[PDB]
Structures are given as C-alpha cells and as structure tokens.
Design a protein around this ligand. Structure first.
Ligand SMILES: O=N[O-]
Ligand SMILES: O=N[O-]
Ligand SMILES: O=N[O-]
Ligand SMILES: [Cu+2]
Ligand SMILES: [Cu+2]
Ligand SMILES: [Cu+2]
Ligand SMILES: [Cu+2]
Ligand SMILES: [Cu+2]
Ligand SMILES: [Cu+2]
Lengths: 334, 334, 334
C-alpha cells in the first residue's frame, strides 16, 4: 500500500524505566508512527564515589527511551543533533532492514538533523544504538543506546494461543562503562573528547567494565525511584544490553514467561530463575507477583550486581501468603 | 489444604556429587519434606599447589548438597549456625517465592538456628545460596551455594509426553574463586575474615577468577573419585553455577536431552554438544552412554577446564562399538 | 549393515569461508565419506600492526575447513602430520561418540599419519579441534579447530515440516588468540614452541584475548574477500567458536531461522537480532537478503568486533526497497 495514505500518529516519549502509553491490541491498521529524539552530550555522575563521565545520550537519558509500535507499522524518527554538542552521531535500529539498521543514512554533525523511516517487519524487543564508522564501541559504551518494542498486532500470546496481557511495563537498560584508569587504579579525567579517545580505546580493550549500572547510575532504581507493583499484578520487564551478555534474575521471584532473546514469534521459556540476554540484544520477562515486600532485580553475576552497580529494587504492596512461604521458627539462640 | 494435615518426611542428605535417594514418580501427594543443614566455615585446599582458602559451606562441602522434592511439596529447612563459626549467614532459594527467596527470614549469627518453609511451586533444578545484605558475592564466591531439584510429580518427560527415566544422577557444582593476589601475582593469606574482606572485594572487582573448580578443588572428580557409568546406562547430570556463566560439554559424548536453563515445563534441547548455563542458574543434561572408557566432563572454555580446574572424569564400563567409532589405521610412520 | 558394503566417496576440501560442494538432499543411502587433512604449523600475521604468531592448523587455514556429511554417514579421516612440523597433534570431533571424540585414537608425531572412522549419528553443525593431553587449550587457541556439518538426509526443515533450502553457505570460524605480553603491554616473540609454552599458559590464564578474529586475521572477510549475496538469496552462515562464547549479529539484517546451539532436530529460533553460541559449539543462521549494500557481520561485543578483530562484511547486489527503509529528510543544517 501507498505510505502517504496510511494513518499517522505522533508519539511523545518518557524517561526510562517508564514507557510511553500505547495499546497492546492495535486499534488501527498499519500506521506511520512519528518520533523525535534530541541527542544530548552531558556530564553524568555514575556512582556513589562521585565518578563523573561524559555521557552520549538519546533524549538526555541512559538508556535512551523505549519506543513502542506494532508489527508492520512504519517508524519515522526525526533525529536532532544540536550545535551545543561536539560529536558526530547516527542511529542503528536492530528492528530495521537495510543500510546498517539506518546508521548509513542518519549521520548528523552538530547543528544538523535528519528523518529516517523503516518498516517494523518483525515482532519483538530490539536494541537501537549510535554507531559512527570508526568509533562505534566508544559511543555505545558512553550510554548511546536504547530499545524499541514491536508488539504483534493482536498483543502477546502464550504457546496455547491465549493472550498474555501485562498490567504494567518497565524498561531496564543495562550499561557497561569503561572509565580509563591509571596504573594505580584511579580514574582519569580529560579536557576534550578527543584527548580522552585513545584512553577510552585502551580501557575498552581490557574488556573489563569499571561499572555496570541500570538506568545510568549505581542505585538509580532504588529508594524513591524503586520500581513498584501490587500482589497479583502482571508486569513485563524489558531488559537490554547493547554490548555485553547479562543474566537477569528477580530475587524472590521468577520469569513466568521469558523471551530471553526477545522475539515474540517464538514460544517463551517458562518458570525461569535466570536467563541469558546476549550483548547486542533486548529480552523480555513476564511475571505475576505473589508476595509483597522488597525484591532486588539483578544481573546474577553478583559481583557485577552488588559491587559494580547492576541491581535495582521493586517495592510490592499487598498481603503476605504463608502457604507460599513462612518462618516456622524465627532466628534464635540454640 | 491445611499444612498440619499433610504427610511429612525427614531427608538425610549426602555429599556431592552423589544425591540422596528419592523416587522419580512421587508415591505420596504433596508433603512437607524436612531437611537440616549445618553451616561450616573451614579451611580448604583448592589446587595442586596447596593454595588454602577460608571456605563458607552448607553441610561441610562445596557445593552444598543437592536437595530433591516434587512440585507442590513444601520444603522445610532447619538451618544451624554453630558458635564455632565466626560470620552471619542466611539462605536464598531460587525455587521459592517471597522474602528474597528466604534470605530476609533466615539471618543467623553464630550460635543461632532458624526453620524456614516454602512451597516448591515450579518444577526444575534451581540454585540456592547464602546472601547476607551487603556481603552477598563474598559468601557465594567462598563456596556457599548448592542446588535443589523440584521434579514433576509424574517424573521427567520428553516432548512427545513419554517418560525419561534416569538410572543414576550426579550433581556437579562449579565454583569460581577470587583468591587475592599481590602485584607480583602471588596469593595473599589473611589473619581474620575481616582483614581479608577488602582484599576479597578488590579481587572480585577484577571479574577474573583465579580458580574454577568442580566439587570444591582441582581434580576432585578424578582418580578414585571419578564419576562412573556402564554402557547403556541413562545418566542425569545436574550442573549449577551461582555467579558466572558456564558451557558444559561431555568429551566423547553429548547431552541427548538438555534443559540448559533447568526448568522442566519446557521441552529439552536435543543432541547438544555444549550448552550455556547462565550464572545464577542450575541446568540438567540426560545422556545414555554408548561407548566405554574415560570421558572428561568440562567447562568448554578449555583454559577454564585444563588450566583453572573446571574438569572432571567419567570411567565407563562395557563393550566397545566399532560401528560407532574405530581406528582404521593406527598412528604410524609415513 | 556391514560397512565394507556401503557406498564410498572421496571429498576434496576448500578453504574457509567457502564450503565444499555437497547436496542438501542426500542422493545415496548412508555412505563412507573419505576426507584427508594435512596439519601445518606456520607463521601467520593476524593484525594490521604486523603481529606474527606460530599458528597450528588443519590444512593450512584458521579455521580448518568445513566438512559436510549426512546423518548416519560414516566420516573416515586420514590425518597427516608431516615431518616438517615440530609438535604432536590429534583430532576430537564433537559430532562423534567415544574415545574423547577421536583424540585418544589419533595421536600423531611429526612424520606419522592415522585414519579414523566414526558414525555421524546426530544432525547439526559441530566443532572439531586438536586436543593433545596436557596441552589442549594451547593447540585450540593457536587456531587448531574447525567444524563439521551433519545434514539431515532430507535437508533442513522449518517447524511446520517444510523445507528450508539455502542458495549459498559460508563458514565463519571465530578465533580468540592470547599473544603473550610483557608488563609494558608489548607482544613477546619466541625462539621455539617450548620456550613459548609457559608464556602462552600465563597469557591464557588471564582469560583476556588479545585478538578475536574471523578467518584467521583482522579484516580477512573484508575488501576483496568480503562475503557476497544478491537480494532475495537464501544464505546459511555456519559460525563456530571452540573456546569462548560469541554473540553473532548481521548489521542491517537478522537471523530469520537460527539454531544458536547448532542441532537440527530442534526447531530454530525465529527473527533473531543476536544469538549466543557458547564456547565449544557451532551454530547456524539462515537469512534471506532484502536490501542491497554493505553489511557488517560481527560479534556484538562491539569492542571485540571493532577493536579486537571480530568483524567481516557482506556486499549485497540488487534493488533498494524504499518501503522497507528510506531517508525522508537527508542530513542537513537545522
Ligand atoms: O538470589 N539472588 O542472588
Ligand atoms: O572436545 N572437548 O574439548
Ligand atoms: O548494529 N550493529 O552494531
Ligand atoms: Cu553517538
Ligand atoms: Cu548493533
Ligand atoms: Cu554465608
Ligand atoms: Cu540468587
Ligand atoms: Cu595440535
Ligand atoms: Cu571439545
């Protein structure tokens, strides 16, 4: 069909871990879904010690926001690189077909913009990331990555062909950073991106992240920013990692239905404790909460979780089920 | 149903790689299965060089013993921390729902005990591990982890709905250790756990294990302690890794049926050479032996296997099948 | 059936990434498929800087060539170790059953040869590699590994039982090297293999590759040696990694059907962006090209791809589809 004849709609994005409002069951036929993102280079404090890096972002956040469309919609993105930025950027969608995912068509210097369109032909969650030729891992590992969800037009299904309907959705972007260190082990600081580049390449080549965080910083998804749910609520957690493997795990829960490699035409894996999301992939886990209280949601390399930053919390409200779990004899001397 | 009315039974555990006797087909309805484990902090020699660490164990072994129940049984564990220990401990079951898997309800100082109950609602093999708030990876990577198998009530099945019945079962716990090193590369020794802690955190933060072993030490599953089987015997190998990915492989065999991420409501992967068990997961592989002789069972990062310790042996008895394999021309000059 | 009565055929191998001619649908019943490979120790330049290593090869290439048979054929390999070599070698097939995959039966000193036969009882792609007792990871990580494809007799199938027929096939072998470094970080050179050995073991024990390459060198599958396809062509890419995990990704495409762990009795995963091939495994991805131009095929640890070598190219010929992707507004000031 002629694209000028399709319905169109403009989306307004939200900051992770929240996700812009959408309908699971598509209420139109295929449409052109219009997004705008503004690139922002900015200083970010990433840990409790105060370590500050020069982050490269889509729309001011690490990760960039989650975009949501349906299968066979067209994604039309206006990408803006303001003149207050210093570097060249572009965008590669793993959801898209051709021209290096879009990166060959979207190179923008500071002071430029561009508009890309692609057809979202395959249902799933997918990574998107900046990828300028010759400096690709530097941009990705400076935070310049996010994800897009392409829902089936009829929503998610279980393997029996019955619907799986989530009540809430969160997007957890997991970021490996490589802050350059001196031989004593202290982080270096730099005067310009160009003076940092070789140091950044050397740090990356060690293959050892200095920090691994959710939503851009140690502790970002804790305290006043903990994730929330009620007992009985169905929650979808989309989780991306653009550069290294991760192994997500809900401490005190499970993934009832998990698309570990993120693609909805496949039946989900059931009853997972932990799953493997390869670097360069988005995955998705569906869980119905059964107990109240605090949960930690982690990368289950527990060093990566509890020493390097890859840990957030849920606070869950409701009644405690002693059939599922109880303390028979509380800790006591003996 | 009211829990005080269910059948009960007391289990007596065995040391890995052996597994306490149980029935594949459950002969009772749901029951309360009572276990006791005693925590033991102890010195362990982990390699041929004599490197000695302060291990943290459930029941005196690394890994802790395999517990076996059926789906919808209740697990009731009496956890004892004798006053001859120095640290605080607890337990998190990945099989359980609520209170951080049990860790929030089971904190025991030296001289204390506690009794936890949980309903085993999902069939599979699962990790269990100690997880005291603020020192989680230190306990796990000191050996304080094991696994629990929750069998379907009707036993294991293939994808056609026919039974898979094992003749023998082994439990391989794989442990990554992070022994602190000085700048020359030699292992440090410490006077108290507290004096070691910061050094342990620094070693963990490198993300590079110094040792990766089966059953607690280099060579533990070799020689007089090699695993055994006969030609034609059906063997289930349960394999856990509480903190890092592993890639198991039977040298000279296969995994005929593999639940790589361990959950029995999913159809197994067939005919595997090698499979990925994510850190924080237990998996299970079923194989029928077809040839006698020595096999090595390894993590197929062969450096991890043959230089760092992640290798054991099977000795298999029976007839050699020249149809499956033969030397046509033995090695000779030419 | 008596093996002396079966048909026989002699195969002549080709250099990767090409694959010897074969039929997807087997035109004979089970047969004895005769191969010969000659071991070659040789100097290889692996990067643009000129770093030269002493490689250990099957048939002169890294990886060794792809062998192709059908399920229940017999593989009969004549392995030759000429007297111009210095080391002892053997071969382990992950496709085979017994005697450590063949390694226990195929030990050849320089000046010796041997002939092994095994029945290829399981369909899939599988790793093969040298594995001399006591020096296994040194040989594998010096390049001494390849793969074998065991096709079902009726060819590949989708999950509905309909045929998947590829028009072309490529074999990408991915190699992690561990070139020894001094404390300043410069590569060491050695006078004999024996003088290098301890240094090689120390480098391996860091677990950190210095190089990760396709087809034996940085840039090997680029320029005049880029992979090629036409729009509409069905391509199978077999990808092996004998020692570390990889996460393959076609930049600008997908894996339409992927056997991530390589075994054809399992239904493929659909619509993958990226997939996890565990170390010690071969996998296979089937894709129909839909857009022309340059693609990069990478390990999606982008540091491993673009800094350490794990990147090749496709050049695809044909018409551009503006329905799938177009630049609406080309980059411009604003
Ligand atoms: O049980 N979560 O480490
Ligand atoms: O074939 N096992 O390295
Ligand atoms: O989108 N490939 O990095
Ligand atoms: Cu950028
Ligand atoms: Cu990418
Ligand atoms: Cu403990
Ligand atoms: Cu855990
Ligand atoms: Cu060799
Ligand atoms: Cu092997």
């Amino acid at each position: 069909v002629d694209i000028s004849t399709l319905p169109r709609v403009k989306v307004d994005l939200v900051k992770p871990p929240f996700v812009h409002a959408h309908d699971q069951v598509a209420k139109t036929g295929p449409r052109v879904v219009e997004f705008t993102m503004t690139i922002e280079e900015k200083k970010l404090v990433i840990d409790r010690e105060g370590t500050e890096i020069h982050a490269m972002t889509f729309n001011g956040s690490v990760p960039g926001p989650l975009m949501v469309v349906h299968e066979n919609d067209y994604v039309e993105l206006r990408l803006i690189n303001p003149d207050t930025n210093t570097l060249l950027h572009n965008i590669d969608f793993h959801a898209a077909t051709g021209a290096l995912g879009g990166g060959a068509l979207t190179q923008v210097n500071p002071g430029e913009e561009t508009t890309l369109r692609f057809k979202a032909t395959k249902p799933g969650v997918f990574v998107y990331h900046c990828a300028p030729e010759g400096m690709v891992p530097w941009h990705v590992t400076s935070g310049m990555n996010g994800a897009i969800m392409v829902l089936p037009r009829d929503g998610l299904k279980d393997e029996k062909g019955q619907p799986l309907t989530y009540d809430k959705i969160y997007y957890v972007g997991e970021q490996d950073f490589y802050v350059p260190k001196d031989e004593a082990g202290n982080y270096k600081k730099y005067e310009t991106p160009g003076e940092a580049y070789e140091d950044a390449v050397k740090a990356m080549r060690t293959l050892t992240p200095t920090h691994i965080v959710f939503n851009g910083a140690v502790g970002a998804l804790t305290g006043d920013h903990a994730l929330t749910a009620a007992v009985g609520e169905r929650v979808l957690v989309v989780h991306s990692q653009a550069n290294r493997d991760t192994r997500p795990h809900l401490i005190g829960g499970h993934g009832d239905y998990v698309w570990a490699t993120g693609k909805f035409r496949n039946p989900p894996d059931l009853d997972q404790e932990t799953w493997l999301i390869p670097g360069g992939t988005a995955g998705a886990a569906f869980y119905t909460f059964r107990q109240p209280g605090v949960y930690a949601y982690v990368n289950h390399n527990l060093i990566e979780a509890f020493e390097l930053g890859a840990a957030g919390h849920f606070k869950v409200t409701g009644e405690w089920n002693d059939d599922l779990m109880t303390s028979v004899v509380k800790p006591a001397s003996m």
